[PDB]
Amino acid sequence: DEAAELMQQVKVLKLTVEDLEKERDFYFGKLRNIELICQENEGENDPVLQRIVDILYATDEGFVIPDEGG
Amino acid sequence: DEAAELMQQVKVLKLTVEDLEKERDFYFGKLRNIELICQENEGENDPVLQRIVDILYATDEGFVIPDEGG
Numbered sequence: 001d002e003a004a005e006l007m008q009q010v011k012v013l014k015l016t017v018e019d020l021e022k023e024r025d026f027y028f029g030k031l032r033n034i035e036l037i038c039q040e041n042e043g044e045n046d047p048v049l050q051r052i053v054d055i056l057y058a059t060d061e062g063f064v065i066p067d068e069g070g
Numbered sequence: 071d072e073a074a075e076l077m078q079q080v081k082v083l084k085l086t087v088e089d090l091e092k093e094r095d096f097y098f099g100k101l102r103n104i105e106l107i108c109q110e111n112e113g114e115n116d117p118v119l120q121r122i123v124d125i126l127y128a129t130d131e132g133f134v135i136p137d138e139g140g
């Protein structure tokens with residue numbers, strides 16, 4: 001029953017995919033909403049948004065990702 | 071070659087999983103960092119953080135998720 005076990009695997013895998021897909025873009029649209037607050041207040045009123053833009057472009061990786069936070 | 075095709079499937083599935091897993095928690099820790107700015111400024115200095123907390127608890131779902139943003 002080689003493939004039979006793999007049938008279970010694609011199922012548990014795809015379901016993890018589906019729940020992860022939803023979350024990825026669920027919060028992804030959220031960062032934009034926080035960035036939209038930034039576009040409103042950056043330089044205009046509140047500098048706090050500047051350091052939250054830093055969040056949306058904070059890349060904790062091995063390689064240093066080039067970004068421009070302004 | 072039934073299982074052979076499934077071997078490919080678990081691979082492409084798991085890889086999507088792995089890249090999605092990293093992103094889920096990658097940004098997940100980020101929302102906390104934005105929330106930490108909130109804990110600093112909420113009621114103290116900047117009300118902007120209040121409406122960004124609204125983001126971290128904004129649940130675009132069918133069912134209405136009960137939350138307390140303060």
Ligand SMILES: C[C@@H](Sc1nnnn1C1CCCC1)C(=O)NCc1ccco1
Binds near residue numbers: 056
């Ligand atoms: C967090 C995103 S920022 C980003 N990337 N595409 N769109 N956006 C927007 C979403 C939030 C604000 C801009 C980022 O730098 N990823 C790092 C990365 C991974 C691969 C290439 O680079």
Ligand SMILES: C[C@@H](Sc1nnnn1C1CCCC1)C(=O)NCc1ccco1
Binds near residue numbers: 101
């Ligand atoms: C966005 C999170 S808020 C959340 N949930 N667990 N920890 N956190 C923290 C991360 C950001 C600030 C608090 C949320 O309501 N999900 C909706 C949900 C899905 C299932 C149950 O409920």
